From a paper:
Electrons for reducing O2 are transferred from cytochrome c in the P-side to the O2-reduction site, including heme a3 (Fea3) and CuB via the two low-potential sites, CuA and heme a (Fea), while protons for making water molecules from the fully reduced O2 (i.e., 2O2-) to 2H2O are transferred to the O2-reduction site from the N-side via two proton-conducting pathways, D and K as described in Figure 1. In this paper, the cyanide-bound fully-oxidized, mixed valence (three electron-reduced), and fully reduced (four-electron reduced) forms are abbreviated as CNox, CNmv, and CNred, respectively.
The distance of 2.15 Å between CuB and the nitrogen atom of the bound cyanide indicates that His290 is replaced with the nitrogen atom of CN- upon the cyanide binding, keeping the hydrogen bond between the His290 and OH group of Thr309. A water molecule was hydrogen-bonded to the Tyr244-OH group and located 3.48 and 3.50 Å away from the N and C atoms of the bound cyanide, respectively. The water molecule was not detectable in the fully reduced form, though the Tyr-OH groups have enough space for accepting a water molecule. Another remarkable structural change upon formation of the CNred from the CNmv would be the large translational migration of the heme a3 as revealed in Figure 5 inset. The structure of the residues 380-385 in helix X of the X-ray structure of the CNred exhibited a singular structure different from both of the structures detectable in the fully-oxidized and the fully reduced forms. The CNred structure indicates that blockage of the proton back-leak from the hydrogen bond network of the H-pathway is not as tight as in the fully-oxidized form. The residues 48-55 of subunit I, Arg438, and Glu198 of the X-ray structure of the CNred showed those of the fully reduced form.
Residue numbers in the entry:
A (entry chain S): 2 to 94
B (entry chain N): 1 to 514
C (entry chain G): 5 to 84
D (entry chain O): 1 to 227
E (entry chain P): 3 to 261
F (entry chain W): 1 to 57
G (entry chain T): 1 to 84
The structure:
């Protein structure tokens, strides 16, 4: 046995390295994981990160629905899914 | 910048646009060929005075319509434009390889042109059976250029299948399971699996034809212990999957169009629709010998292939009834795309039914190699595929271009086409039942009346094609820019506007798990 | 063919009800359609058949364990 | 042969073709029904202002949409397979005739006793006798005895062809290196016509088949006269 | 600008040069078979190799040097290579179907027997068995190479990969010699046709797979692979196992059962 | 041999606007022009051969 | 299954090297012996111009059109027999 093979910690670069570093911190800036829903009430809305002022949400209103409900979520007051009413609130950066 | 954008593309929408342009151009070629067929048959006697040329026209008509019109439009055009948008993905998995699947098609089509220009062309039928297609009955380069055209088309589609399967499996939002993807995306996935498995078998068979013609192999030559019938098995082992490949993306588009213009958020019976397409895909590999009921097969084999073939009508019927159940209770919008989709349902059903007639090997003895088969497949496949293509094109043209069509003109175009294709192909059932062979340049005099009517029909559809070109021109000429569309909550491809920006989903959708 | 993402419980139930049990039903049809007794062949006392080197440890020693009088001849032929 | 404005099958000349006609009548009714039901339902779904756009449960109705088509297919497959197995059943013919396809004509061999063979070419339109049929006549017809079970063996000495006679329900591909068998039995005397049924090159449209069915005693005199 | 992990590829000329290479090779084969000239074919082979070299060079630049192969991108490439191998399995399936069709029902022109009259097959216990041990052994050595890489051991990865490539080259030279020594030819009816087309396509895949292993060897000499990220090596090993399994099917079917 | 991957990472990440197929420097441009000239000229040559082969010669 | 080893535990690099040198390369050495013992030229068979062999439906695109690509004069007869 012997060494001489670089590790990812040593040699990963670019976006690969950013994803690796973020994963160590437990963060998901590149949207690799599915977010877990809150209760979705007005008091406990689902918090939707965005780098901008609007992002498309898809809502799978009940588990196992095959129809996904899509809409732009805008910064400001929380909006509700037009099918199930669950609340979403944009959280820029 | 032009060359970078349109020759060096790595963008799914621009590559989709290239495929739609290519497929539309090929559609003109294939239509011209079909009009030459029907001109030769439009009165008794000879028109071209060269029945080898007639056979070359028939063969090229089919290769053009299948490999250069339907598959590039459905999979390369609608698939590239729509699949990434419908799953919120930023492009295809292999965006550079995708461009090579496109760029292989103009050389493939050039090889087909070359085949028809050298020697006396490949007057083989699109099946290319030896020994007619071998080096004694088709000496010279034409058949070899046809084989190479198919090789390039096959590589393009195999790599495209790898791309679509990978994209659909790997690039959906993390919360979206396969059972949350739209039916068009399912239809493309299944079509791609069929292409992946079936085209390599065709590639093997046509390569053995190439080596029998040029390297003194004898795979299909009995003098060496070969067998012409082995070629037929290899060809049809691909060719049955191929007919489902040609229609499955059409089924996907029809599900979306019928849902949309019924004012519904979803198709009836989503999981049944997925089941039905998977079942058709699977059964589509075990029925091919129904193209071979007159070659001399054992009776028990004929019985098995009759029975397996009829089993496919069950999952197909689920889809037909489910489209009817999607209409059920709808706020029906009588848009031109809806008319195309309703025409598709009816004409596909007629053609599928005559296919069920043909599935009975006893009756197929009498109907094989007659115009009954030509009528079956111009209903169920040729005009099924064309009507789904026109429905999708009318429905999504405003997304791809940013401009609206004139709906009254588009309805006129539908009406002309519906008349024309029915006048062309319905009388071919009578020709087949009364025994007229296919692949003939002239016919006994008894068959004159229905041939005359069928050829008159072909000119009506020509008038429709010319009108379609004018309608597209009128939309680009007038520049009515889209503002809004309804039902965006269940039609994600529209939510980035019209046309969507070059890059979409740079920030992916947010979809949680509850 | 298709799905290939997650092979979870939902996919395996889909395969059970959508492919596996339909296949069993089709084969059950196929079988209960070729069923029906077929003519038993002429008895011929071939020496490589109906072997008896020791009596069976049940019955009269001369009947196989799942003897079916309709289709299983004894060494002396079919039973009456 | 076919006649002007014909819509269905040529009249049956053999018992098997009769069976096919009745089986076709049975199946075409089903095709008509299903096609008209789909058309009807399309119009039924499109002709009400009443709506129901919320999610609809699909399980109950999908049982109907699978079980009924399955029953219908079985009701087609049963007579279809009975006819298929009838065709294949042992017949014991009295005569064997071979046909060899060529580009572009047929040859015939009657080698049970004598070694008789001949070629059979389409009559060009310029040579037809008045009232003869364009693209259908041949110079030498396949003389055969009526009301007798005949074995035809079909092959080719070049490319694929296919030997067909619609009114007898016959189509058997002609493949070099292979000897395909079919059985022929005409209930009636007469002239029965068919056309090459696998694309074989430029003159595929112009190599017809013409059977001439006559009583056995006349078949024997014709055979004898070939000596 | 993106907040997904996928790779937006720079606009590239290699799809077009690859597609034109295919036009030149196919029109080139046509001109060679029919018009007694190798010119177009030589241009097409050259442009094909240039296109492959530059395209895969760019994939290395995008991944080792630029960092674009996130885990999501790597997962896509895993699916892509599996799907590609599946399509190559179906291509060989067509040649096995031709072989079994002809050998299970030998026609009268063969003597009605298999092997045909006048065919004297190779002894499968001679060079064909040696070739089988060679490809099986190289499946063991490539697995040693893979584990050495995962365990961070540069020297033993290189030794094991070198042994694997040496065995692939040995197979190729043994098969070239067998082709020369064979007393039957591709023109010897369906026996020669199935033998040389099926084993020839396999030999092409051995050369392709050996070349891919050689690329991996040089990339390893240049330290491109990490102990956890080395998909080009994984893909070349999957392809190499595919080439080994196709050989085992050829050996059992054509050389042994067909002798 | 020594691990020089970091130096190639710095080269291919330099913000010079070059697409990856040219980012190695002048040699990339040569190989590109060679490849493209062979492809386009060979394609023109293939069209000539088509014209030649389309007529009895 | 009809093997006879043992180790399992972990299959790591050391185990696969052990297999490479202890089983795989010795097997190649033995088959190389087996093969380099049954090497040698057997007596070629009488030529018979069987019509299913030496097929020529189009000339080959190299040489004189009548020689296969890896033609071996010692063992590959032409349609007319062995060469002199
Ligand atoms: C169906 C596609 C649409 C296009 C329809 C155009 C044609 C209209 C028919 C529209 C209705 C079609 C009915 C069949 C027409 C011929 C009647 C007949 O006696 O056919 C019998 C047989 C053979 O029969 C015989 O053994 C000879 C019987 C002849 C003796 C009586 C003489 C007079 C009968 C009247 C015939 C009229 C000639 C039609 C000449 C037509 C020229 C164009 O022919 C056949 O098998 C034809 C095989 C067709 C297979 C597909 C059937 C499903 C589609 C139609 C139903 C959907 C709803 C249509 C509703 C239509 C909504 C648009
Ligand atoms: C889009 C292309 C397409 C599609 C989808 C089909 C679908 C079918 N095809 Fe067709 N076919 C072709 C294109 C296609 N075909 C082509 C091109 C050829 C000829 C190739 C050549 O030789 O060049 C051909 C040839 C062909 C033959 C060979 C005939 C011969 O050469 O003698 C046969 C035989 O079985 C056949 C049968 C069928 C069947 C049973 C279906 C089924 O999948 C149809 C199922 C659909 C329905 C049945 C209708 C909807 C169902 C319901 C409303 C439910 C209730 C119905 C019942 C209970 C019956 N086809
Ligand atoms: C997709 C497949 C397809 C399509 C669309 C068509 C279209 C047509 N075909 Fe078809 N045809 C075949 C596939 C198809 N055909 C095949 C496989 C064969 C068998 C070949 C063989 O025997 O080897 C055949 C054979 C065949 C024959 C039998 C020849 C013979 O046996 O001798 C005839 C005869 O009338 C015929 C006529 C027509 C006509 C009149 C049309 C059309 O004119 C009908 C009107 C349709 C159109 C005009 C389509 C226009 C669409 C576009 C222009 C796309 C526009 C694009 C965008 C909007 C993005 N075809
Ligand atoms: C060392 C092990 C072998 C390594 C590979 C060596 C070269 C083989 C190349 C493989 C290409 C495989 C194509 C198979 C075509 C036939 C070649 C078969 C293998 C071979 O090399 O066969 C030789 C014949 O080659 C001949 O004809 C000439 C063959 C050259 C011309 C081939 C032209 C055809 C290529 C068409 C390819 C189509 C591919 C399409 C892919 C599409 C997939 C989507 C056998 O020589 P022989 O003298 O007859 O008998 C030996 C007597 N002592
Ligand atoms: C339906 C499936 C299970 C069947 C169960 C019936 C009892 C068997 C128990 C064990 C079964 C294991 C295999 C034993 C060997 C023979 C049984 C084979 C299966 C069987 O049941 O065979 C039957 C004969 O059984 C006979 O002789 C009588 C067999 C009864 C005595 C078996 C003796 C035990 C053998 C010792 C086993 C040692 C194992 C050691 C392992 C270490 C077949 O009936 P038949 O009338 O001849 O033909 C049918 C004509 N209509
Ligand atoms: C023609 C004759 C026909 C006769 C009848 C034929 C019958 C064939 C029978 C088929 C059996 C079929 C499958 C049943 C499978 C059950 C295995 C259950 C355990 C299991 O499944 O877990 C596996 C455990 O692995 C592990 O390390 C397992 C480790 C076990 C260690 C044992 C060590 C023994 C010594 C080995 C030394 C080798 C050195 C060289 C996971 O592997 P997998 O990728 O899912 O593949 C399973 C493939 N069948
Ligand atoms: C060729 C061989 C095959 C031929 C096939 C012929 C097929 C004919 C099919 C027969 C259809 C019979 C329908 C049976 C199911 C009936 C359901 C129903 O009768 O009712 C509908 C239920 O809708 C739901 O979920 C589900 C509602 C609709 C479910 C059925 C939808 C239509 C299905 C048929 C569609 C027509 C086209 C089919 C082809 C409406 O009900 P709700 O409870 O929501 O409102 C009640 C609210 N209150 C009571 C609390 C006030
Ligand atoms: C008769 C003679 C006919 C001759 C016809 C010859 C036709 C074609 C000329 C071919 C020129 C090939 C040039 C190299 C192509 C490499 C493609 C490749 O490697 O594609 C990759 C994807 O396919 C993957 O992995 C998995 C797939 C790898 C495929 C590699 C190329 C295969 C070409 C032959 C295909 C048919 C195979 C046989 C099937 C029967 C990468 O995808 P990109 O989108 O590029 O990048 C994505 C980035 O994230 C990477 O950093
Ligand atoms: C002819 C000869 C062709 C021989 C094939 C050579 C292929 C060389 C591929 C080199 C590029 C490569 O291997 O690229 C790798 C990706 O794989 C990829 O695209 C996978 C690319 C798959 C290439 C598949 C090639 C199969 C080719 C078959 C072509 C013809 C087949 C048909 C014959 C009839 C790059 O990722 P990694 O390795 O993880 O490195 C990144 C790490 O350094 C980060 O730490
Ligand atoms: C840098 C870009 C510019 C590159 C230009 C390349 C120009 C090449 C022109 C030469 O053409 C060659 O002529 C040969 C003889 O005239 C041919 O051999 C042919 O004739 C021979 C006679 O010796 C036979 O042995 C061969 O089998 C047969 O293929 C050969 O095929 C063909 O290519
Ligand atoms: C990057 C751009 C590359 C562009 C392509 C290069 C163009 C090459 C021009 C040379 O053309 C050659 O001319 C020869 C005639 O002089 C031909 O020989 C052929 O014709 C001869 C007769 O002159 C015969 O000996 C043989 O059939 C054969 O060798 C051969 O086919 C052909 O290629
Ligand atoms: C179990 C599976 C998926 C259910 C889901 O998880 O949503 C469903 C989807 C489609 C269903 C099938 C289709 O509805 C077609 C058939 C309908 C019959 O009523 C039962 C068998 C039948 C073959 C169904 C079995 C099963 O309920 C399927 C396969
Ligand atoms: C030079 C290099 C040392 C690793 C490093 O560069 O530090 C060593 C390590 C392993 C060596 C290789 C491996 O031992 C495998 C080969 C062994 C052959 O006997 C010589 C060439 C051969 C290919 C070696 C060449 C060279 O000496 C290598 C490549
Ligand atoms: C239809 N096949
Ligand atoms: Cu002979 Cu068609
Ligand atoms: Cu089919
Ligand atoms: Mg046919
Ligand atoms: Na005509
Ligand atoms: Na690994
Ligand atoms: Zn919701």
């Amino acid at each position: 046995s012997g060494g001489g093979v670089p590790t990812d910690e040593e040699q990963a670069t670019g976006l690969e390295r950013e994803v690796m570093l973020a994963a160590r911190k437990g963060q998901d800036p590149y949207n690799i994981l599915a977010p877990k829903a809150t209760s979705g009430t007005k008091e406990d809305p689902n918090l939707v990160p965005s780098i901008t002022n609007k992002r498309i949400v898809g809502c799978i209103c009940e588990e196992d629905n095959s129809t996904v409900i899509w809409f732009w979520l805008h910064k400001g007051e929380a909006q509700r899914c037009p099918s199930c009413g669950t609340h979403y609130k944009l959280v820029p950066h | 910048m032009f060359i970078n954008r349109w020759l060096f593309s790595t963008n799914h929408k621009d590559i989709g646009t290239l495929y739609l342009l290519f497929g539309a151009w090929a559609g003109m070629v294939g239509t011209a060929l079909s009009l030459l067929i029907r001109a030769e048959l439009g009165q008794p006697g000879t028109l071209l005075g060269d029945d080898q040329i007639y056979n070359v026209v028939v063969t090229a008509h089919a290769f053009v319509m299948i490999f250069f019109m339907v598959m590039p439009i459905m999979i390369g055009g609608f698939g590239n434009w729509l699949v990434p948008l419908m799953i919120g993905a930023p492009d295809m998995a292999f965006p550079r390889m995708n461009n090579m699947s496109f760029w292989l098609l103009p050389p493939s089509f050039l090889l087909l042109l070359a085949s028809s220009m050298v020697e006396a062309g490949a007057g083989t039928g699109w099946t290319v059976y030896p020994p007619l297609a071998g080096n004694l009955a088709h000496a010279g380069a034409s058949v070899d250029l046809t084989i190479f055209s198919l090789h390039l088309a096959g590589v393009s589609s195999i790599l495209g299948a790898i791309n679509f399967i990978t994209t659909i499996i790997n690039m959906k939002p993390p919360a979206m399971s396969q059972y949350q993807t739209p039916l068009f995306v399912w239809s493309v996935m299944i079509t791609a699996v069929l292409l992946l498995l079936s085209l390599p078998v065709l590639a093997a068979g046509i390569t053995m034809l190439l080596t029998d013609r040029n390297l003194n192999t004898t795979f299909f030559d009995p003098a060496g212990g070969g067998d012409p019938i082995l070629y037929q098995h290899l060809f049809w082992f691909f060719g049955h999957p191929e007919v489902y490949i040609l229609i499955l993306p059409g089924f996907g588009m029809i599900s979306h169009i019928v849902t949309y213009y019924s004012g519904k958020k979803e198709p009836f019976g989503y999981m049944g629709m997925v089941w039905a397409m998977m079942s058709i895909g699977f059964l589509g590999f075990i029925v091919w010998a129904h193209h071979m009921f007159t070659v001399g097969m054992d009776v028990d084999t004929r019985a098995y292939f009759t029975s397996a073939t009829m089993i496919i009508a069950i999952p197909t019927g689920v889809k037909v009834f489910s489209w009817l159940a999607t209409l059920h209770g709808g706020n029906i919008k009588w848009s031109p795309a809806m008319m195309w989709a309703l025409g598709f349902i009816f004409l596909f059903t007629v053609g599928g039914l005559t296919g069920i007639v043909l599935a009975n090997s006893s009756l197929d003895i009498v109907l094989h190699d007659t115009y009954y088969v030509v009528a079956h497949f111009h209903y169920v496949l040729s005009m099924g595929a064309v009507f789904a293509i026109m429905g999708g094109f009318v429905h999504w043209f405003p997304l791809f271009s940013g401009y609206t069509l004139n709906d009254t003109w588009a309805k006129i175009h539908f009406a002309i086409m519906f008349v024309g294709v029915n006048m062309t192909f319905f009388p071919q059932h009578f020709l087949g039942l009364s025994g007229m062979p296919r692949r003939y340049s002239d016919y006994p005099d008894a068959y004159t009346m229905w041939n005359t009517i069928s050829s008159m029909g072909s000119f009506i559809s020509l008038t429709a094609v010319m009108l379609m070109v004018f309608i597209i021109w009128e939309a680009f000429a007038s520049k009515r820019e889209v503002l809004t569309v309804d039902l965006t909550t269940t039609n994600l491809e529209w939510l980035n506007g019209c046309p969507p920006p070059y890059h979409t989903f740079e920030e992916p959708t947010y979809v949680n798990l509850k | 063919k298709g799905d290939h993402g997650g092979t979870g419980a939902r996919t395996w139930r889909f395969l059970t009800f959508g492919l596996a049990l339909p296949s069993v039903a089709l084969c059950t049809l196929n079988s209960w359609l070729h069923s029906g007794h077929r003519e038993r062949p002429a008895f011929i006392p071939y020496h490589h058949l109906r072997i008896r080197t020791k009596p069976f440890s049940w019955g009269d020693g001369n009947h196989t364990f799942f003897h079916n009088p309709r289709v299983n001849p004894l060494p002396t032929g079919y039973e009456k | 042969m076919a006649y002007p404005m014909q819509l269905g099958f040529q009249d049956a000349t053999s018992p098997i073709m009769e069976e096919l006609l009745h089986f076709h009548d049975h199946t075409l009714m089903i095709v008509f029904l299903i096609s008209s039901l789909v058309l009807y339902i399309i119009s039924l779904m499109l002709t009400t202002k009443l709506t129901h756009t919320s999610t609809m449960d699909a399980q109950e109705v999908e049982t109907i949409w699978t079980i009924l088509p399955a029953i219908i297919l079985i009701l087609i497959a049963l007579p279809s397979l009975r006819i298929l197995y009838m065709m294949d059943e042992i017949n014991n013919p009295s005569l064997t005739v071979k046909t060899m396809g060529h580009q572009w004509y047929w040859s015939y061999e009657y080698t049970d006793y004598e070694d008789l063979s001949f070629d059979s070419y389409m009559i060009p339109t310029s040579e037809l006798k008045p009232g003869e049929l364009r693209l259908l006549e041949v110079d030498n017809r396949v003389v055969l005895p009526m009301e007798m079970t005949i074995r035809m063996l079909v092959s080719s000495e070049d490319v694929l062809h296919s030997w067909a006679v619609p009114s007898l329900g016959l189509k058997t591909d002609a493949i070099p290196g292979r000897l395909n068998q079919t059985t022929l039995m005409s209930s009636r005397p007469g002239l029965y016509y068919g056309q090459c049924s696998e694309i074989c090159g430029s003159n595929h449209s112009f190599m017809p088949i013409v059977l001439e069915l006559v009583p056995l005693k006349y078949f024997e005199k014709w055979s004898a006269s070939m000596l | 600008h993106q907040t997904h992990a996928y790779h937006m590829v720079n606009p590239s000329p290699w799809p077009l040069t690859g597609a034109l290479s295919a036009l030149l090779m196919t029109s080139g084969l046509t001109m060679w078979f029919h018009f007694n000239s190798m010119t177009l074919l030589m241009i097409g082979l050259t442009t094909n190799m240039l296109t492959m070299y530059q395209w895969w060079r760019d994939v290395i630049r995008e991944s080792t040097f630029q960092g674009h192969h996130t885990p999501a991108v790597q997962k896509g490439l895993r699916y892509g290579m599996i799907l590609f191998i599946i399509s190559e399995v179906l291509f060989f399936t067509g040649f096995f179907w031709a072989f079994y069709h002809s050998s299970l029902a030998p026609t009268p022109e063969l003597g009605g027997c298999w092997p045909p009259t006048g065919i004297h097959p190779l002894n499968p216990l001679e060079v064909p068995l040696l070739n089988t041990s060679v490809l099986l052994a190289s499946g063991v050595s490539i697995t040693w190479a893979h584990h050495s890489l995962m365990e961070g051991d540069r020297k033993h990865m290189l030794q094991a990969l070198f042994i694997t490539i040496t065995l692939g080259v040995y197979f190729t030279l043994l098969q070239a010699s067998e082709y020369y020594e064979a007393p039957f030819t591709i023109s010897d009816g369906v026996y020669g046709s199935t033998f040389f087309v099926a084993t020839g396509f396999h030999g092409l895949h051995v050369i392709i797979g050996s070349t891919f292993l050689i690329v991996c060897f040089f990339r390893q000499l240049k330290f491109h692979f990490t102990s956890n990220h080395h998909f080009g090596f994984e893909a070349a090993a999957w392809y190499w196992h595919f080439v080994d399994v196709v050989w085992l099917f050829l050996y059992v079917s054509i050389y042994w059962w067909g002798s | 041999f020594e691990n020089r991957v970091a130096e190639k990472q710095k080269l291919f990440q330099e913000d010079n606007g070059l697409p990856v197929h040219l980012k190695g420097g002048a040699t990339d441009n040569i190989l590109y022009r060679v490849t493209m000239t062979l492809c386009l000229g060979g394609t023109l040559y293939s069209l000539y051969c088509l014209g030649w082969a389309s007529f009895p010669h």
